[model samples]
Target: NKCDVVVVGGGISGMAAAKLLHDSGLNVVVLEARDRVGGRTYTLRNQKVKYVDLGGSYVGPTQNRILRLAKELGLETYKVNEVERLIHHVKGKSYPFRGPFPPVWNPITYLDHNNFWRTMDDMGREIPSDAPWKAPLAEEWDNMTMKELLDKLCWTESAKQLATLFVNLCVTAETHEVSALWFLWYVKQCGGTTRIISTTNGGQERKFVGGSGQVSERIMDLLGDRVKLERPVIYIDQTRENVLVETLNHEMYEAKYVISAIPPTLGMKIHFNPPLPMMRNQMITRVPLGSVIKCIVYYKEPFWRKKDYCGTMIIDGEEAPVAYTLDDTKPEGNYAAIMGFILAHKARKLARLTKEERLKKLCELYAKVLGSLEALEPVHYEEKNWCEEQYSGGCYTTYFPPGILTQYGRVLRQPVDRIYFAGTETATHWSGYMEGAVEAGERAAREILHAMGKIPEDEIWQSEPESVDVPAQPITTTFLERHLPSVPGLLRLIGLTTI
Candidate 1:
């Protein structure tokens, strides 16, 4: 049966788009490859801990879209445990540090850190979240890898290690694996790198009361029978008039339009009738999935909290696969746990080892950091290797190496025939995050709605009301010239003139 829309991939982006289309009184069907929804936002239960986020978990204060959805779903969120000091392991030495400062012996390390962050922040402001490649320096920046940028900036070895670890944790990709422009675009998505890194007022601030996956699960509940699970889309034959979607199991779906919300890597698996343009094909093929293993170790109580450490540790070295670990215990729950991320090449390499080997190494690292015998013996342990996952391909997010973003990024969200794109990667703001996924879905839904004549394209965006008390002041050339001198060079480099 023909419907108004067909949404492929039952992740947050697909469900969000389907829900909007359905709510708009349009018939929509959501086909999911996996038996479940949520995709990257998987929640684990029945463990020693009350609940664990095996995929994407925390939502920062700036992630307004997800927070609003959670509130509307009648779900609540709680603040993560605030650690007074975070443990830093470097060169086989443990350094406990606190409050707006890192445990760096050299004062030069502090300067290097601040300067590097400032430079990235400046560069980020120049790249619009929606169209990073359009920036004036896009070509130049995109041609260089993050590592190359660090080397050009003359980063100290200590600075290089810290920066690499930070970016690795964020993108789940090695520094050399991502373009400098791609990294700056991520910072723009989160408002700034500072917000992305900071925990007190930043990305690691809060988690859902039950689990982050509840958001997607709740959305699935509202979607009802429209969502079809275990329906892996194998082919998409689209025409200017309509789109026919077929699953690996031989089931078929036809709709006036189709929205593909799956990761680029997964989407590339499906054969298109006319085939996508070379640019789009190359985008999906060239951009690689980031490697990540999200692991949670449950304990009887928050042992590190007793030491006033907050259970946060940043371990720097190739000796262990664990890059970072944090307190993941619920605010009001019986079980305590610490979440650890084995990122990038480390995660991919460790994937070859037996689960017992990985568990043993993690246990040893935990014992080393926490200085507790119980740390060696977790009550429960669970891990999700996204790289080995059939559908996702990888996790945290995917990244573009040098040249791809500037050369082919325009094709990211562009529609091909009757099909549209909706995924976190296509989002202009907060790309690669749950918020970005929601935004991308909503944007694609609106585009389809407007195309169907159900809504006007221009009417889709309502203009903000002008302030009543706002007074217009006449601008003078001299005033502009004087003020523009104080503006940051990077900001102006992207095109912002003055205020």
Candidate 2:
């Protein structure tokens, strides 16, 4: 087979690239390892409920490309129901809280948590979005894990657990496994930790009416038959001007240009003739995808909401299968469900467990956290173990281990001759996000267009709409969301009442 370009990986990035390249009058082919598309994002329409997001699903302000793409793809979206009270679970106990703030133990603990977020945001602001390796303390920070930073900054167990949970949920990896520099850069690129974490006025604020997976599926619809499912690229030989790609079936494809639209970790499966540059190889090995098993449990009703709870909860506990959960109920009044993530080391530990066991464990967890027997009797359960996903390797996105970000970070998206790179990791604006993946795919296409004289060099980083609908005036979050508790007998501290 021959074409102008061959895209390996049929996720959002690859499909986005194929869409753009094909629109530009270039023949393109997308090879997917799995029979389906969407990559890290999957919508479980086959399940009992109307639909469920098994993977990446949310979009919010500052994630312009994702929002614009959603609109362009003719999808209507809705905001998360963050108005009700939320929960914070710790050591077999649960605390009710409002907004994005996780309830703390004492004022000292509050200050400690506040300072921790303050320092993290402060440090992140110092790092440049494009050239994070060039930051002043890049070497020093990159050499240290987020755990090391946590130890130096936090004093109490409450503070420590909250910080750890933040990193665990965000990166889908343990604090000890993530580099401080990388986490800082990750937060910086996404606007801020608050913006990324918060539902209202943050990255997770909006949702696709149907499911986010439709974004890629719709793109595939436009470029019908051009994408080949079950054809995972096994080998690639780039001879400067032309590139050769081979699938597992020994089928071959020759193209003037190639876009590797998979994660760097997944790309390791492919053998390159000249091999990638030493730096690229060194960096790729150091960074691995964060482990995550996204699960959705359906209920007859969002009973938590009747208790004035938002259904959002964080579990800083042992013996629990889920690390965190959300009010995954749809915008309609009738539907009800919650999204849970078995993240990081826990995901790895429970990989041996069957779906039945995992589902039971998750339901029991909800029953306890929500303090309702109804949670124990879910109508149906759906889950995606991304770690066991052969093509994906893991979920959410990949993270840099200590010392690699500064040493070999630049190779993240840099093109090598006719082989271009495209994925969420390569995006500068919203890296490791759906928006970022779209931006990366389009950017890689633009790079090839630049080489072919189809677009100017500056057109590669074209401006994405920043101010769309959905209020984002306060693009950043303050360390102090609510100094006092809104509800009595809810917050850990009794004195934190009124206002």
Candidate 3:
């Protein structure tokens, strides 16, 4: 089989690319390893209850393109009610504390946390609120580890523990394994942690007319038979002239161009005939992808909300039960969805345990905050072990230790031979997000269209491509240079709750 373009990995990035390419009057094929689409940003629906996002759940209004697309699709999104203070678990105990002025025992007050905030604040004050990459030491921050920076701040034991939790949840890695600079960039991209916390304006839970899967289904619906399910790419041989692709079923296909949107770690498992460039190899190894488990337990009613609980919890002093929420219960209904998320490290741990053990642990965690396990009985449950999947060894891209952000961050996204890269990990505005994936995919399609000479190489937008990219902002070096140094540092220094 031959195509103008072959997209490996059917996540948001690949879907976006395929969508753009197909719309451009080119033959395109998307090879997805999973049985379904949506990649890491997936949803699970039960009985008659609305869908609950088990992966990449929330899409912020200000910076998220996925939510914007949802809105354009006439999908209604609910906001997250962050009214109650965050309940942080440290050293086996849960503590409710406010942000900015965290409780005395709240560990984020340590100097490194302060330094991380201060340095970011300094960046904001020195650079533009939108750009952190062009700011001083933007490159240098990638050089240092988040834990090392935390150590420099003379972080307290509790502070370090709290910082680890933050690192674990956000980056899906340990503090020592993540870079200090990349950490700041991560926060900066989120309009700083302050805006991330003060997001009371948007409703607590946001969903589409039916569910998030609707968005994926809509995209696939447009593509029709162009996409092939259960067809995982096993090998690829790329040369200057053409690219050859082979699937696990031993099926062979060829294309003028190949867009690799597979997760960095998963891409490594694929056999590249001519072999990928060293930078590509480093991206797969050094970018440090990690796993996460999304467990959605459905019940007959909204149990936790009856007790005025948000269906939220944070394991005190431990990492297993990182966080959870009672989501998708709004717009008035008896059905409720309880979502439990486990970061890479803990998710792997839970995967090893028996189903009985896993459920028992879940019950214990819920009982602590919600009072009883019976209230949230299972109508049925869905568990997706992203790591165990042969193609997507982990949930999504995350920052890693030593040379990750500082050394290999930019290199990871650089093109290899004729192969271009697009994934949430490669996105600048909302990296590690579905929005970023869409942004990356659309960008790749535009690149291919230009290469085909159908569109001017210099032309920024392809009409059909703009169907997805029109309202979206591109993350470029110019964007970095303009926004990084100009962003405000006050919020970075002081922390969220900056009224």
Quote the lDDT for 194 in model 1. Answer: 59
Candidate 3 lDDT, tens digit per residue, 183-283?
A: 66666665555444333422122445456666776778788887888888888887546788888877887899889897766777688878776766766
Best by lDDT: 2
TM-scores for all predictions: 0.90, 0.93, 0.80
Name model 1 segments beyond 4 Å from true: 100-105, 459-499
* Model 3 C-alpha lDDT versus the unseen true structure: 0.63
**Model 1: how far residue 30 lies from native, Å:** 0.2
Clashes of 1: 0
lDDT of 1 at 338: 87
Per candidate, the number of residue pairs that clash is 0, 0, 41
1 or 3, which is superior by TM-score? Answer: 1
lDDT for position 277 in model 3: 65
Q: TM-score: which candidate is best?
A: 2
TM-score of 3: 0.80
Clashes of 2: 0
Among all windows of ten consecutive residues in candidate 3, which has the lowest summed lDDT?
467-476
lDDT of 2 by residue, 300-359 (tens): 988998888888888887688887888888898556889888889998899898989988
Query: Model 3: how large is the Cα RMSD against the reference?
Result: 6.9
Cα lDDT tens digits, model 1, 314-411, are 89998867989878887874578888999999987899998888888898998887777879878888898998888888988879999999988898
